[PDB]
Each structure stands twice: as structure tokens, then as C-alpha cells.
Amino acid sequence: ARGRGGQVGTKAKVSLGLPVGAVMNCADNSGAKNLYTIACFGIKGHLSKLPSASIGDMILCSVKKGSPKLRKKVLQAIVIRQRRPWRRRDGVFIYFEDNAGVIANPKGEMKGSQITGPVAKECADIWPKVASNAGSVV
Amino acid sequence: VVRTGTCSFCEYRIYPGRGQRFIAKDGRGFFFLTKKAKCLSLRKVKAQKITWTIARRRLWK
Amino acid sequence: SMARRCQFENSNDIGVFCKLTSAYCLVSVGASENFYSVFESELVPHIPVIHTSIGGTRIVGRVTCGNKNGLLVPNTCNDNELRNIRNSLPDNVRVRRIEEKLSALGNCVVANDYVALIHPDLDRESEEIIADTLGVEVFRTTIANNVLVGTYCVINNRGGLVHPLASVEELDELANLLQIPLCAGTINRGSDVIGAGLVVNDWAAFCGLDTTSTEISVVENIFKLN
Amino acid sequence: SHRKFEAPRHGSLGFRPRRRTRHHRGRCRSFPKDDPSKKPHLTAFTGFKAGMTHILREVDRSGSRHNKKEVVEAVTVIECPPMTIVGVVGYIDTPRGLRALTTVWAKTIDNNTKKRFYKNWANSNKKAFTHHEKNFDQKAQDLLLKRIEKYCSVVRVIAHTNMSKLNLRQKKNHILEIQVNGGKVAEKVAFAKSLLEKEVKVDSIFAENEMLDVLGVTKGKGFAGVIKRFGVKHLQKKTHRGYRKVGCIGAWHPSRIRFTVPRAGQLGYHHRTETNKKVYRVGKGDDASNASTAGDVTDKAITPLGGFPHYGVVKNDFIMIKGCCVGPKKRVLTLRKSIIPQTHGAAKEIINLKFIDTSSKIGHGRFQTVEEKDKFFGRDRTKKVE
RNA sequence: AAAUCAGAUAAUUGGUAAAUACGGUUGUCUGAAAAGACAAUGCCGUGAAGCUACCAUCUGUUGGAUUAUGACUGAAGGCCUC
RNA sequence: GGCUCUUCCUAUCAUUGUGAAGCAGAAUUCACAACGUGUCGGAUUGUUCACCCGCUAAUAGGGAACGUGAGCUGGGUUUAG
RNA sequence: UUAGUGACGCGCAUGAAUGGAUUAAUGAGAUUACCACUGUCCCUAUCUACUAUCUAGCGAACCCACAGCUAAGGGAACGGGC
RNA sequence: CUCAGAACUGAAGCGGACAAAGGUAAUCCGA
Ligand SMILES: [Mg+2]
Ligand SMILES: [Mg+2]
Ligand SMILES: [Mg+2]
Ligand SMILES: [Mg+2]
Ligand SMILES: [Mg+2]
Ligand SMILES: [Mg+2]
Ligand SMILES: [Mg+2]
Ligand SMILES: [Mg+2]
Ligand SMILES: [Mg+2]
Ligand SMILES: [Mg+2]
Ligand SMILES: [Mg+2]
Ligand SMILES: [Mg+2]
Ligand SMILES: [Mg+2]
Ligand SMILES: [Mg+2]
Ligand SMILES: [Mg+2]
Ligand SMILES: [Mg+2]
Ligand SMILES: [Mg+2]
Ligand SMILES: [Mg+2]
Ligand SMILES: [Mg+2]
Ligand SMILES: [Mg+2]
Ligand SMILES: [Mg+2]
Ligand SMILES: [Mg+2]
Ligand SMILES: [Mg+2]
Ligand SMILES: [Mg+2]
Ligand SMILES: [Mg+2]
Ligand SMILES: [Mg+2]
Ligand SMILES: [Mg+2]
Ligand SMILES: [Mg+2]
Numbered sequence A: 001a002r003g004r005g006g007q008v009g010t011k012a013k014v015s016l017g018l019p020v021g022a023v024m025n026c027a028d029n030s031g032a033k034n035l036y037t038i039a040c041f042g043i044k045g046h047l048s049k050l051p052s053a054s055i056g057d058m059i060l061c062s063v064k065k066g067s068p069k070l071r072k073k074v075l076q077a078i079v080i081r082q083r084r085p086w087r088r089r090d091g092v093f094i095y096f097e098d099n100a101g102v103i104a105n106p107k108g109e110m111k112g113s114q115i116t117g118p119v120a121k122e123c124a125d126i127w128p129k130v131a132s133n134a135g136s137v138v
Numbered sequence B: 001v002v003r004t005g006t007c008s009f010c011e012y013r014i015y016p017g018r019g020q021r022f023i024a025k026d027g028r029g030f031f032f033l034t035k036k037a038k039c040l041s042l043r044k045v046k047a048q049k050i051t052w053t054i055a056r057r058r059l060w061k
Numbered sequence C: 001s002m003a004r005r006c007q008f009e010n011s012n013d014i015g016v017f018c019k020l021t022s023a024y025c026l027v028s029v030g031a032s033e034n035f036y037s038v039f040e041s042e043l044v045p046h047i048p049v050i051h052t053s054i055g056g057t058r059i060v061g062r063v064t065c066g067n068k069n070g071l072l073v074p075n076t077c078n079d080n081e082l083r084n085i086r087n088s089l090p091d092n093v094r095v096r097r098i099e100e101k102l103s104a105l106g107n108c109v110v111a112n113d114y115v116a117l118i119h120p121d122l123d124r125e126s127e128e129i130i131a132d133t134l135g136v137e138v139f140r141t142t143i144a145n146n147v148l149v150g151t152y153c154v155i156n157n158r159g160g161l162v163h164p165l166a167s168v169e170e171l172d173e174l175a176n177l178l179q180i181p182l183c184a185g186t187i188n189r190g191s192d193v194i195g196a197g198l199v200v201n202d203w204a205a206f207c208g209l210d211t212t213s214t215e216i217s218v219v220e221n222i223f224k225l226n
Numbered sequence D: 001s002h003r004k005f006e007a008p009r010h011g012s013l014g015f016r017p018r019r020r021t022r023h024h025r026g027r028c029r030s031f032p033k034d035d036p037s038k039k040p041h042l043t044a045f046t047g048f049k050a051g052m053t054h055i056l057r058e059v060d061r062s063g064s065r066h067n068k069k070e071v072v073e074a075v076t077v078i079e080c081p082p083m084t085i086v087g088v089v090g091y092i093d094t095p096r097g098l099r100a101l102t103t104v105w106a107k108t109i110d111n112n113t114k115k116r117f118y119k120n121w122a123n124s125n126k127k128a129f130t131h132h133e134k135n136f137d138q139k140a141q142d143l144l145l146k147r148i149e150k151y152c153s154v155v156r157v158i159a160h161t162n163m164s165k166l167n168l169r170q171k172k173n174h175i176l177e178i179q180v181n182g183g184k185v186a187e188k189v190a191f192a193k194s195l196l197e198k199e200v201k202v203d204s205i206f207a208e209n210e211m212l213d214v215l216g217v218t219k220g221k222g223f224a225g226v227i228k229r230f231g232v233k234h235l236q237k238k239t240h241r242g243y244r245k246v247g248c249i250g251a252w253h254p255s256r257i258r259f260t261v262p263r264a265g266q267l268g269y270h271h272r273t274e275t276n277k278k279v280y281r282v283g284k285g286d287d288a289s290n291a292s293t294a295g296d297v298t299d300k301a302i303t304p305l306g307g308f309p310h311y312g313v314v315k316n317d318f319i320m321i322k323g324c325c326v327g328p329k330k331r332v333l334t335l336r337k338s339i340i341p342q343t344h345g346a347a348k349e350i351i352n353l354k355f356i357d358t359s360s361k362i363g364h365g366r367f368q369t370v371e372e373k374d375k376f377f378g379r380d381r382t383k384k385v386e
Numbered sequence E: 001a002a003a004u005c006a007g008a009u010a011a012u013u014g015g016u017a018a019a020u021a022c023g024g025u026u027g028u029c030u031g032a033a034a035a036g037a038c039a040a041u042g043c044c045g046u047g048a049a050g051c052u053a054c055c056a057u058c059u060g061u062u063g064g065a066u067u068a069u070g071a072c073u074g075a076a077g078g079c080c081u082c
Numbered sequence F: 001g002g003c004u005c006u007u008c009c010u011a012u013c014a015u016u017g018u019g020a021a022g023c024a025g026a027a028u029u030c031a032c033a034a035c036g037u038g039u040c041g042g043a044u045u046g047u048u049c050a051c052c053c054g055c056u057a058a059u060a061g062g063g064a065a066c067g068u069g070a071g072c073u074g075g076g077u078u079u080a081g
Numbered sequence G: 001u002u003a004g005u006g007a008c009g010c011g012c013a014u015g016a017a018u019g020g021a022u023u024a025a026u027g028a029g030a031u032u033a034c035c036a037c038u039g040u041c042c043c044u045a046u047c048u049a050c051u052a053u054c055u056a057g058c059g060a061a062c063c064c065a066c067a068g069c070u071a072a073g074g075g076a077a078c079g080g081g082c
Numbered sequence H: 001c002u003c004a005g006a007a008c009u010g011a012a013g014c015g016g017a018c019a020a021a022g023g024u025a026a027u028c029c030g031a
């Protein structure tokens, strides 16, 4: 029982900003502060090409700082904000000031209620529960 | 119409395809025409105090 | 009348993909025919069903809010989407673009044709805009001590469904507040995300496929559609 | 040793050997499939790379991420001044392949084209085509054309790039074969004849939202290390001779190096046939409106403020293509029609243009027009003139 | 529509700066100001052109003959069977 | 031994077209034409191997002086402390 | 986590100045985490000086049976020569 | 020749070049 099943469509092209090992903020109230990036789904690489995730992706991660109940296990998360500038159909490039993610079950459900900070557009279309829990969506 | 954006540092008039965007913890977005713009406004320099700005030109007209 | 089940692509989250008020319905642009069917079939003559997108996204459900006097779109909104909307809208209803740091208007605002509940931290100007435009009395609250009311509670002029963990006390306060009966429950087979699973207005209810017979019963019963 | 981890090879062999090109303007070694369907049409055309800009369009394409929204896309502008037609050329099909049967020259061959035959025009007595002039007998020409009608499979027009219309150094024109595709040999010939000593416009050939092919020479990068050339992965930075090498030139047996292993050498100045570029606009060097839109409703010329960098002002007509194409600014290019007419989605897409950027490229420009810069700084040049 | 590959481009966004471009500034030296120079690029910020990257963008067809296999007609061998 | 790179084998892991089943579907297994293309990111170990964590259409098995030191590297092995 | 640490110890082959057990300061001494850090890496780009380049002048050395394109074959069982 | 106060002023920069320690917790040796 794994994967991204609750994704609602195609995810747009975003410059991949979070390779493996990347540690990002965790914006949910799950009680985990951060997410250590282990893999990213749907990737077959080239030799020695680091697996990379971006806004909207579903990663496989672990919790480095947070509730002792959460760390030491392998969880899935969904990237919300990234600091790596990507580009949108208007030609403008954007970025947030942090790298943020929300722990989720493979079905696309969040474990948590409030999501701290804004969530990127590119995450909403893909993940309606995440979108539901957004305070703001840019 | 040709829809024009405004630069959140100097309030210069921006057209499509040029420039970038920042998004702070607040959710406050900013839209910069120039790298030089971004650098300043993220260095937290006050637009008013820089001469080529429209801010400065406001203060002193 | 009856509550109908649908699916947007494979998701049950219809609450995310459309906005239903007594005067209009909004649905996202790329939908399957079956979606549109389940909507048009019931609401077609009576209300405009308006296909749109907001900031070029299909989430119109969570990003805007409104009742039959008004529509409040986020600053996410592209000019053309706005125009499209004004042109698809009866002249009675007015449309406004708000700048609220909290950009999901559908998440941060629940409204029926009288009362509106807002995110505790929302801008005063946003408040009086909801007030003036929608023509409503506004109260800042938290359903189930969660700040997203639009997401965690659903309302028509008759009654409302709220997050299943709302205490009896809370339920009372709110009922008194909105001047309508409230009921705690779940939708879409156990989900606590009631807003995402349900849309309703005075004569019609759409909800996700997996909503159990029991749950729909609950809905039909509190929303007083018969 | 079976090699340890399997990755794809480091270049396309079909692109080797990697040396420079003989063909300077484009060389189409195929012209589109010929069909009897339509009256004879002219196969390709010649132009020059001016600059790039970006566009804002609205997408009607259904099913797309972008349906009914504004997109911004990169675009190349290619100046396309009128080509002149000089001659006709018949080809025979022989068991050893095609062959040139004959070339019918007009009376009018302007000096600059004659330049082709000379390395320097001005130190020469300019003797070229003299005998074709003094001896010119229209009857004979007609006889030759009739000849071609009689014996010929393929008909091509000998075409003339008139360089005098541009501002560049090179004034010496270009001499092309543009094959003629149309049903009956005879009509091909008639057509060809109609063309002689006349000027052909890009509109004659290419339409809007039409799909294009661009033929030309990659920019020369000179002698290239292996990393730049084939994109090998660079060796460990600790490596004694240097790390920009490939590690193993080959195994013991065979006793030599295969043509397959990457090595140093020239990169750049090759010929490429790039396929399926979309035409966002075709415009006349007369319209001062040519850079504007239904949505714009103001005067705009495609030439960016301060002019296209390292190119100039575009006074002539032009084609504006989606994306980028081969070569540095000022490289001539041959735009050929698609081998088979393109039926796919991107090719059917009707293009609605909203913004075309005239903003300076020499810097980061915020002004779309002089008038704008001036209003901003309160200098009226119409005022200084007055 | 994406991934891996292939071939290019540089409008945009990034990267690069010994254009020593313009500004800032430490120590010294020219009586001072002004203007500079020396500290193998003093240091710092922005920095056009160029080069450059999935860290940017564009583009990557159509027939014929056949294999395995499934069939038509069919004889050796009245019937049978690719 | 690894790194780098190229090519070959087919006793085919995946992809193409098929035959077979104790082939309902889904999945799987046996076989045929067949390499044309692909066959990845990390823990520990000098490691070949092995074992685990993962993504993946798949994470096939091999050759080329047990491919590849005037290509590196020098952890292992095998001088002198 | 064949790594590190703490424990257990049917110690191949621990053990008492052939010293056993400890141990602050201490170390260009062996090992493991972690924090900061970063071009080690993902993934490679760009800039400077000196070279390699070309020129005037000057001007060696290693090595050298005979020589120098391969496929197979046989052959002192991997030929360049047959 | 040392030390301390207050106020004003700059793109919040100011040991501006030069000079100039990265930390922490463990294990083994040898004081
Ligand atoms: Mg770590
Ligand atoms: Mg590797
Ligand atoms: Mg291969
Ligand atoms: Mg041919
Ligand atoms: Mg390249
Ligand atoms: Mg050397
Ligand atoms: Mg720049
Ligand atoms: Mg000084
Ligand atoms: Mg001075
Ligand atoms: Mg001096
Ligand atoms: Mg000195
Ligand atoms: Mg120095
Ligand atoms: Mg500098
Ligand atoms: Mg810089
Ligand atoms: Mg592509
Ligand atoms: Mg393709
Ligand atoms: Mg076989
Ligand atoms: Mg068997
Ligand atoms: Mg490794
Ligand atoms: Mg070996
Ligand atoms: Mg020893
Ligand atoms: Mg380790
Ligand atoms: Mg262990
Ligand atoms: Mg030590
Ligand atoms: Mg010379
Ligand atoms: Mg010399
Ligand atoms: Mg032999
Ligand atoms: Mg041989």
C-alpha cells in the first residue's frame, strides 16, 4: 500500500529544486518540523543523476526534527513551496523563501489540519486535500 | 489592452516576459523588474533612500 | 429532490472543483462530460452553470466564495477569468476581486444567503467587503477549533454539516450564531473534510461518490431538501 | 568485463563525422514530396536571422494545460527580403541518378548576382554573362524550355538573394535552386517562365500558422574538448593529466580505436535541417503596424528599441517563428516546406497573438517605444526637432 | 503531457566580469582639494555584450519487403491439410 | 576494485508482434521472431560478491588480455617502521 | 549501517613491571556520529595569467633487426611479416 | 599618552585591504 493515488491530473513542468537529501520545512501541524528527502516518485534516471522533486511532487522522506513518534520511520510528503525559481505560463519566474512540504498518506490525504504559509498553485490542481487545507494559494 | 505590471521596488512599469517574483513567509508577493531591484528590496534597502527610484522622486518633488 | 453523487476525474473532492450558491454554479474548465451532466441535469434552466478557472487552476471551489448577492474571487484571478465570470453572471449578482493574504476564499469563508463565517484572521476590509458585497452578517470563528471554516463547514439557508469533532457546546454557539440547525458528521466515506466532499444550496446537493447511504441520509436530512 | 552500469551512448552517430560544412546557405537534399495535386508552387525560400523576442498569445488548443489562457513564448525573427528569379533548370532521370539537362538564363542578371562568380567585382572587367547578353535570342530560350518540357522529370527555378536590400557587409547575392512542385511538367515550365526576371515574396510561399523547416549552419565553436563536444561525464577532479578527458579510448582488442568513441575536435559550423517550426507571423516591411496586435492598437515595428543586437533594423518583410533556429545573427537560412504537409495538432493550431515585445534587448529594457522613454523622462524629440 | 536520448539556440531567468564598465571602501603616496596610482584582479555591490544550463528555451517523419504467428486456394494421397 | 568510454553476445529483465495454460477479468507462468532501444539513486564493505532502503517499463546474465594504471585512483594485496 | 558505541563472553589464541585495570592535561597519531560549511556531488559553466599554437633566433634526449591497415586461419596454443 | 559618556549621519555598511581558530559528543593508543 503506497504511491501517489490521489493526484487529480498532470503536474506542470517545474525546475527540479529538491534533489535527494534535500531537507525542507514541514508546514503541517503533524508535529514534524522538517522532511529529509529520500526518493521522489516516477523517476528513472541517468547514471549518477540525483533524483529530484519540485513543487507538486510526492516525495518519500523521513522526519529529522519533530515528535519522536514521527521520526525514525519512512513517510510520504507533498512539496508545497520551493526556493528554486521555476517559470509559469506568463514567462515570469517565481520562488518562495523556504522549501516546504506536507506529510501525506499515499492516497493524497494529509495527516494534519492547518498548513503554515502559502501553497503554490501547482500543488493545488494536483492535490485537492492539500488545496482544501491551504490558507492561501499562490 | 496590454496589461502592465508595476515593480514593487521602484514602481517601474513592467511588461510581459520580463522580471521575477518573490513570496515571503507572509504570503506577500513581490514582483521585480531587475535583478538589481530584487537584490535591493531583499537587502531591505528602502526604496525612498535610493535616487533612481520613484519612491525617492516622490519624497522630494 | 435528492443528493447526487459525482466524481471529478477520479477524486471525490467535488467541493474543490465547484462553487454552488442559490443563484449560480461554478465548475472547473477541463471536466469530463459525466461531471457536467450530473450538474446541468439538475440545475440547468434554473441557474447559470459557469465553466471557469481561477489563476488558471481548477480549484475554483476552494479559492472563491459567495452567495446569491455576490462573488469574491482571490487576487489569483486572471482578468479574463473575471470577465468571463461577469458575462456569465446575472446582473443581480456582483463580482469582486479581493486581496487577502489568505487567498483561498472558499477555505476561509463559509456563506449562505444571510450569515457568513470567516477565518479569525482575515482583513477588516475583506470582512466589510464580504458584508457589503454578499450582503451578510459576518462572524470570525473556528469550526472544531480549526481556522478554515469554508473547508470544515457546509451551509445552506436551512441547516449545516460541520466537522465531526465539533463539541456540543461549539455546535450550540454556531447554531445560535447562524440562526440555523447544525449537525456534526462526515462525508465521502468517513472524511472529516466535509467542505471538500460536499456542495449544497437550498434545493440541491452534490457530493462525492463514496459517501455512504447513511451519510447521504444525514445530508438530505439536515439540509432539508427532503 | 561486462561494463558495470549501462547508460546510453554519448552522441548520435548519424551526426558524424563532426567536421565543418561545405554548404554555407542551406542545402536541402530533399525537396518536399512532389504532388500533382496543386498548381506548381515554389518549394523553399531564403532569409536571414535577425533576432529573438517573446510573444504573448492566447491558446485555443483543446485538451491542453493551456486551453483558453495567456502563454508567453520565445520567438525568432527572420528578415525575408524578396528573392529574384534568374533561371530555369531541367533535370533528367538517369540510371545513375538525376542530372542537369539545362539552365535557361534571363536577359537580366544584376551585378550583385554576377558577383557570385567573382571574388572581387571591382578589380574585374565584369565580363560575366556578356555573351549571353549580346547573343540573346528569345527564340532559342523558348526552344530550351520546350526541350525541358520534352525530356524532363524535375523542374527548378534558379533564384536570387538580393543582398542590397539589407544593411550588412556582404552585398554579393545568393544563387539557389528552388524546385517547383506541381502536377504536369509542362505547367511547371510555364510557371517557371512566368517567374523569370521577377521578384518573389515570402507570402507567395509561406502562410501563417503554417509549419516550416529551417536549413542552415550551426554557429562555429571551433576546436572543442570532449566534454563540450559529446557531453561526456567529467573524470574525477583528482585526476593527474586532467579531468576533461574521456577515461578509456578503448579496450585492448580490437587493436585500434573505433570510430564510435568520442574524441577532441571541431564543434560548430555544421549543417542542420530543423523540422516543424511554426510561423507565428509573416509581415510586410511596409506596415509600421507590423509588430502590433488587434489587442495592441498602437504603431509597432518588430525592430527592438536600439535595434536587433549584432544585426540591425529590419526594414524588409519577415517571418516570425516559434522558438529558436540554427546559427548566429545574420546567418542566411533556407526555409523549406515540410517534406509531407503536417497534419498534427500543433500544426492545426490557430494562433492568436496578443503581445509582441518591441522592448530593447541591449540591456534589460522597460520601454516599448521611444515615445515611451521620452514621456517618462520628459524629452519630446518632436519638440527638439521643432 | 512527461522521462531518457538526440540536435540547436540565448527572447526571458540564472551563472560568469580584468568591458577594470560605474559606484563604494581599507592602507599608502602625489603639500591640499580635485584626480589618481601601488597592494601580480586590494576588497565589496550592481554590471552591457559574449559564452553558458532541464538552472533557460525550441525541434525531433513516411513507405516497401518480410519474421514468428493466424489464414485463403490446394495436391501429392478421391477425403485431409496454411 | 571502482571511476570513465566503446563495442560485441543472447542462455531476453523491460519494450514490439505472436503461439500455449490448471489463460473469466486482473495478475502470472511456458514458448516463438527478436537487442532495435533501455536496464537507475543510497546505507555497510577496498571490495567481485552479499544484504538492506528506494524509484522504475524493467531495475536481464555475459564478452572484449577475469576490456579499460605512459586514463586516473591506490582503499585492498605484497618491501623496508 | 561487514561501520561506531554499550552490553553479553562454550575467550581458535585476554590476563597481571614478558605488567593487568584505570586516567585529567595532551597529539600534523588510528576510528564514528552530529552542527556549521561548502563546486566533493547532482552538472557542469564562465573569467585572468603562463603554456600548448604561429613567427625570428637558438636547439637536445629516450628509442631504433626490418618495418608499420585489418578479418580469419594455421603457427612457440593473441601476427606486421605467412 | 590612556578610559568612559552623549548626539547627529549613511543602501544596517564600518577587524571594509592587509592580518586572522570552524564546532560538538564518543572510542583506541601514548602519560
Ligand atoms: Mg544527514
Ligand atoms: Mg556513479
Ligand atoms: Mg545500446
Ligand atoms: Mg534524394
Ligand atoms: Mg548543449
Ligand atoms: Mg602531456
Ligand atoms: Mg544577468
Ligand atoms: Mg584612499
Ligand atoms: Mg581626494
Ligand atoms: Mg610605487
Ligand atoms: Mg610585494
Ligand atoms: Mg589579495
Ligand atoms: Mg568586482
Ligand atoms: Mg554578480
Ligand atoms: Mg520536448
Ligand atoms: Mg517526441
Ligand atoms: Mg532466443
Ligand atoms: Mg524448462
Ligand atoms: Mg556510492
Ligand atoms: Mg584486468
Ligand atoms: Mg611492513
Ligand atoms: Mg557512514
Ligand atoms: Mg555493528
Ligand atoms: Mg586528536
Ligand atoms: Mg602570424
Ligand atoms: Mg621558431
Ligand atoms: Mg588460433
Ligand atoms: Mg591480424
Ligand SMILES: [Mg+2]
Binding pocket: H005
Ligand atoms: Mg561612546
Ligand SMILES: [Mg+2]
Binding pocket: none
Ligand atoms: Mg547608526
Ligand SMILES: [Mg+2]
Binding pocket: none
Ligand atoms: Mg567583515
Ligand SMILES: [Mg+2]
Binding pocket: none
Ligand atoms: Mg573536524
Ligand SMILES: [Mg+2]
Binding pocket: H030
Ligand atoms: Mg606522544
